[PDB]
Amino acid sequence: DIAGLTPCSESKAYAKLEKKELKTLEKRLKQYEADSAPAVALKATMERTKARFANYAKAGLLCGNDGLPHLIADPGLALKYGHAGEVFIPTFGFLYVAGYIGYVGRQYLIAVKGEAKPTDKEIIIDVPLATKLAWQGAGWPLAAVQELQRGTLLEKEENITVSP
Amino acid sequence: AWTVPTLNPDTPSPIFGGSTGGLLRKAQTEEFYVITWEAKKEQIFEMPTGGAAIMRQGPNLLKFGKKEQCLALTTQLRNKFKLTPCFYRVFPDGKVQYLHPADGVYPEKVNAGRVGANQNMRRIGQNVNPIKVKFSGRMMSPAE
Amino acid sequence: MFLISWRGYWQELIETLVWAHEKTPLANLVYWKDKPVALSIVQARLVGLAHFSVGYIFTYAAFLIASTSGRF
Amino acid sequence: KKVKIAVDRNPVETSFEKWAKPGHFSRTLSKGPNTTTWIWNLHADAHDFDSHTSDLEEISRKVFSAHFGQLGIIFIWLSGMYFHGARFSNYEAWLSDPTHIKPSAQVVWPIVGQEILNGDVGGGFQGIQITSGFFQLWRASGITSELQLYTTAIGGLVMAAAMFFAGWFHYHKAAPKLEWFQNVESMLNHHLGGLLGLGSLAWAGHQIHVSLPVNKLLDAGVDPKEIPLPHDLLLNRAIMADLYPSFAKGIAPFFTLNWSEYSDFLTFKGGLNPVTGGLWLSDTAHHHVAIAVLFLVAGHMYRTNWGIGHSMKEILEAHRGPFTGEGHVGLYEILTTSWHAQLAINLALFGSLSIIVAHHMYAMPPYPYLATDYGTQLSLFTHHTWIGGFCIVGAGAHAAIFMVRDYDPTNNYNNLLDRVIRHRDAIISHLNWVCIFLGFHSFGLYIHNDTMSALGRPQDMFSDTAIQLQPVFAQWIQNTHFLAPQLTAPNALAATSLTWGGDLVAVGGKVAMMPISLGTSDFMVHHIHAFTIHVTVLILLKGVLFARSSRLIPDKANLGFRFPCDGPGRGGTCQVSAWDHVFLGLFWMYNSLSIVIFHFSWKMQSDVWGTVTASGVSHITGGNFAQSANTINGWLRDFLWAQSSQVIQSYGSALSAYGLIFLGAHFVWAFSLMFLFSGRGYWQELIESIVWAHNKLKVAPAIQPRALSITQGRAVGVAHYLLGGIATTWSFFLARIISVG
Amino acid sequence: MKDFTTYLSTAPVIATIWFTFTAGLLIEINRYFPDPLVFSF
Amino acid sequence: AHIVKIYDTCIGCTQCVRACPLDVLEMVPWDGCKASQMASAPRTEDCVGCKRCETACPTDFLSVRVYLGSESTRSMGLSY
Amino acid sequence: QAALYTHHQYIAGFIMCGAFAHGAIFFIRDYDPEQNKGNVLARMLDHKEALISHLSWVSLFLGFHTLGLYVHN
Amino acid sequence: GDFLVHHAIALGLHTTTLILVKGALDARGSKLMPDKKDFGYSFPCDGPGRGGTCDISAYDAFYLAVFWMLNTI
């Protein structure tokens, strides 16, 4: 109960919709023998389903008027009420991987311009070079903020313009 | 030595059975452009108005309705066959005007005696702004 | 039609219509004053955007008025 | 021997050295990129074999081994469907109850919840209900076991590696010379006799000795594990004489010309097999026998190494008349030194064959339990009309490429081809008129019916209870071809189909095929079809005949086939090239074929398909075609809105993938309008503004970002228009017809 | 086969190997971790 | 009558004249280049403005330059 | 209520895009750089790629993560 | 549902301004065409040269936004 909401372990339309889905799976399950793999598959679907509802209520996800897990994307309402795993943890779990791919792709382009013809090595990726920058870019925020302090991250007004 | 050749319409046409892409009623009111060349040997060229006509030895007279239809004929008569044509401009009052080797020499090569019109003794990046050429009577490009 | 087809497919099509008008018997009595040319490039933007926008507006306004007042 | 084997030993070293250098085929590409237009021109010019080199022999060797690459991929594709027919299917269960068990041969993996796409297709099985109708091929082939599907899947992998070997061998190791390919007399004698003739002789022998005794035992009713295996149907003549009692006479009635004694298993029944809904297989057996004797006879027509037989240079040059000057002189020389001139004639008829195939298979369903499967019937029609329609536009594209590249004005003087160009203004303008005539007098009938029905004047519409425009001629042919076994085809037991009239075939409580009555709504929509095809002809033929020159641009062939324009001059010259006419024709082919498959999918559901109760048979949509196809609003209400209620609420079911692609292709269609409307010089400047922010953070790429080319942004646009357009109708049709049929 | 490894190191081949890597990694994780809507512990 | 005005960044490689499909352009002597020549447009009455000239100029920020003005019966490219 | 809202939204939509249209006509027909040395209007044209690339980031971020959430749903 | 659609409105507002502010700023020229001010506001193109310049003008940069405007509204 943060913004008119309720815990999904406490709401009833959530549990009503769980019983709605398991009803649809079981009336689909009835057409098969109890040994048959079209019934082994559906009972494995249920145990993935029933554990999914158990795990969403375990994490304390917020339901509402429709009985669905609602997310809270604000720190200070997720840090305070124990919901940083909804948005506030994957907003840095993403931005680690995002700037990682950016930094590896940056370092591959920076370390290819001092060559004979760098356009050839954007077709033919230097795999012993590219994987070497791939592994060693794992501390990229530790390397970027040191490059941020110099002035070597931002190229100056050598950049190309039209008519300022 | 060279000056302004005239025309006789007596010169034979290429053997061409006629196309529907030929002249129009503009030839009878505004203008139509006739083209002459001197062919060495009998061979088969393409009409710019679709099809194929065969040229005959000596002079060859042909007529079109556009200027590009004549110059896209000389382009395949000079580059392919190394002939030297010239096309004119005929008005329906009988007046004729000489057009393409207008000083004898073809325009890709210098004649040293043709006058350099429509030039700017300045760089294209040094045009003025359109605020300066505003209210020039009519609408006017800043390159004037 | 004014957005996907552009001008120069249409100017060639009009050149056949000019031919078929200037060679048709008993329609050569009739001749135009302004020469038929295809709509220019900037015009085709405007005419196509106008047909896009009028048909956009009349579609939704028909759906807006009749879905509201149909049940109300 | 003028007709002789002529190859060249080892023209190309088999080496990976040229895979290291992309763009090696062309001079303009082998120097590496400096611009992202390089990697698009790499894939665009890749199979443009006429543009790589000038040597016609080197072109011919490239297209000969690329055809083994296409055949080798088809053999992988066929062997996939037999393998997915074998290991992941219900073809074992389907044969015992082919009325209730839905055909299914694709099974998905249970990972993200996508196992819900494994529907309850029956037969103790879960999987995607397929619609490609392989199970109806296989009952017609008498497969009866998943062992047979597995052995012909391994036979497909073996054949694909043989085809990959053959293209490797006939290019790299021993590649033919030019005059091998220019024996078109020897190619047609071999392809009419050996491919088409001996192929249909061999398949008839499969139908005599395998499929007829298997499917006679299935129709008489035998469980498929109890039927004799088809090699026992060869080694034992006494088994075959039990089913068809004329195998006991052996092959003596053939050589003694007592062919009437083969009347048990080569028949002329006609109509349909009422047990199974399909055509009679003994009818299709006498078909492929008589097809084979026809093509083997026609395969001995042309002259190769002995003086008998015709020569195609003399055949063409003799057929000349007083209206056409030289006649067909010079067409042999351009159909032998130009592949595009071949490819245009080939894609025309091969595309036109596909539409013949589509119309001749709903009406005469050749496979057992094909007609009652309404999902297979809708897909096999719709697919084979589109595959036809693309190939017909490919005829217009590669005929234009002939006019630009391989056309010779020298050798073409006053033949047919020269005289078509010389009156190309009369061709297009009389075609321009008849498109405008068909425009008003077909679609304006719909606007008339819309207006009269909206103005409360239903007696002034064009319908059956109103101003009646009957299809008199097509209703006359249905009165003749149904009465054709009376005296014009006296040896037919029934009609050639059931569309012409008669009674229906009830299989499994569903209509296999009932007669089709044509009305004023069928009149208007057939003239819609005549309209959209004539406009598609208009655009493509304008691109062919004005490929080289016009009154607009006289030097157009010097600019080439695929160029954008000649600039903004002379009013503007956007889309003047012959590429651009087959750009615009794809929309009209899309426009023509959508109305073909809409007129199929609603005439059948209103007037053919549906469940039979022997109590006043009811159709799927209730019988509302002639009642409602007068108006555009009838196509809006009763077809695109009423039948869309199985693709929009199909979530939580196996048809929910079709609901996604229904939104998926509604996206990709509209995504194309970003490309079809906008232009390059916008998007290049926007790239400059974001190269600037990539210059600023030192991530400027070396292969420099450019906007897509003028012809490319059009080609991206029509490709996403067709992909988003067709896959909309794909998912609309299949989510409709799998549920209600 | 050095020229063959250049082909394996071109742009679309590394793209179709790395995308089978990255999808195939996320497919195996989404098998052994069924339906991660929220970061648990 | 279109407005074709060329500039001093011309080098006189005369590719614009060879590309002009209407003989708008010709080559005049001028000392500001090695080839001793600079183009000129004495026939802009005949120009359509199809800009085949400035597809062909090698110089950065094209030396020849076509301004689409008012269109007569010769500028619209009309046989009629 | 349905008509009066939808009317003055499309009327607002056309008027707002004409503000930028006649704003773009300003830079061609009326702008004078010698008159506008260094003011806030010329600094707009000075860092004009920073404007367009940061709009192109916001538009691209929103389109990725609004459509991507609807397709996920 | 109202979270997602206001961001979609925000998408449509930021993208319509992206097209228009680019049409204002690049009305005087780009690197593709550094003298766009010499032609004027509403011109067709600058030919097929320099890679092709369909829809290069600031008019043609304004008209693309009307599609993204009618989308947004």
Ligand code: CLA
């Ligand atoms: C027998 C069939 C056949 C054959 C052999 C050819 C052969 C050729 N065509 Mg042709 N064509 C055909 C059918 C055929 N065509 C048909 C049916 C059409 C009508 C659609 C055309 C329309 C056409 C045009 C308009 C052009 C050609 C061109 C060419 C030449 C080069 C093609 C190339 O390198 O592209 C290499 C291959 C590609 C670039 C692939 C294209 C990508 C497609 C469009 C995407 C669709 C794939 C799939 C269906 C979508 C799902 C994929 C999924 C990942 C989403 C070559 C001579 C070109 C030419 O000669 O240039 C002068 C040319 O401009 N053709």
Ligand code: CLA
């Ligand atoms: C009677 C002999 C015969 C037969 C059966 C064929 C059959 C074929 N030819 Mg063909 N051809 C022949 C003689 C023959 N040709 C002669 C004499 C010439 C020279 C004038 C050519 C020149 C020629 C060209 C230039 C092309 C073909 C192509 C084709 C294929 C058409 C593709 C198709 O529709 O799929 C039908 C597919 C099948 C029926 C699958 C079975 C395939 C069989 C096993 C291979 C064909 C039999 C082979 C010719 C016999 C030699 C066996 C080999 C081991 C030596 C098809 C495989 C086209 C093709 O696809 O290229 C590869 C093509 O481009 N042929």
Ligand code: CLA
């Ligand atoms: C629904 C949209 C639409 C419509 C109506 C048209 C209409 C037309 N297209 Mg077309 N086109 C479209 C979309 C459309 N196109 C698209 C999206 C493309 C993109 C690829 C093209 C590409 C295209 C090409 C490439 C070609 C056409 C052609 C044609 C014409 C042939 C039909 C004809 O003459 O019938 C007559 C007109 C109609 C049926 C429209 C309805 C009019 C009704 C029936 C009566 C008229 C009203 C009446 C006079 C009252 C007026 C009121 C008064 C106040 C003025 C016609 C002008 C072809 C052409 O011009 O040559 C024939 C042609 O070559 N179009």
Ligand code: CLA
């Ligand atoms: C206060 C309002 C206002 C004023 C005074 C102007 C004034 C001007 N504008 Mg501007 N403009 C405005 C609002 C305004 N605009 C808005 C709101 C937009 C965005 C939609 C634009 C977009 C715009 C552009 C893009 C251009 C101008 C141009 C011009 C100038 C030329 C006028 C012109 O072309 O008219 C003539 C107008 C017409 C002939 C109307 C064309 C047809 C329209 C779309 C109406 C179609 C409606 C349709 C027929 C509905 C009937 C459907 C039927 C079924 C019932 C002039 C200074 C031009 C300029 O200065 O060039 C440099 C120019 O290029 N304006």
Ligand code: CLA
């Ligand atoms: C439904 C149609 C549609 C769509 C999707 C777009 C989308 C876009 N337009 Mg728009 N546009 C359209 C119609 C459309 N437009 C029309 C009709 C016009 C009038 C001509 C315009 C005119 C226009 C202009 C003038 C501008 C845009 C811009 C943009 C971009 C906005 C940024 C954004 O949201 O990025 C998000 C994009 C997406 C979510 C689409 C990507 C889809 C997925 C994520 C890609 C990956 C999926 C999958 C892996 C790919 C499969 C391919 C293969 C593997 C099989 C975006 C690409 C602006 C721009 O460039 O901003 C950066 C811009 O300046 N457009």
Ligand SMILES: CCCCCCCCCCCCO[C@H]1O[C@H](CO)[C@@H](O[C@H]2O[C@H](CO)[C@@H](O)[C@H](O)[C@H]2O)[C@H](O)[C@H]1O
């Ligand atoms: C590719 C060459 C073209 C010709 C096709 C040949 C395909 C190979 C088929 C071999 C299969 C055996 O075929 C043949 O076996 C037996 C031997 O005559 C025949 O069987 C018959 O002859 C036996 C002895 O005469 C007796 O049991 C019976 O008369 C009867 O069973 C079959 O009627 C025939 O099918």
Ligand SMILES: CC1=C(C/C=C(\C)CCC[C@H](C)CCC[C@H](C)CCCC(C)C)C(=O)c2ccccc2C1=O
């Ligand atoms: C949007 C658009 C563009 C912009 C489209 C850009 C230039 C290309 C789109 C993205 C391309 C496909 C690059 C993306 C993939 C690259 C291979 C980079 C891959 C990197 C990772 C994704 C692996 C045009 O260039 C254009 C040109 C002419 C008319 C209309 C338009 C048009 O509408």
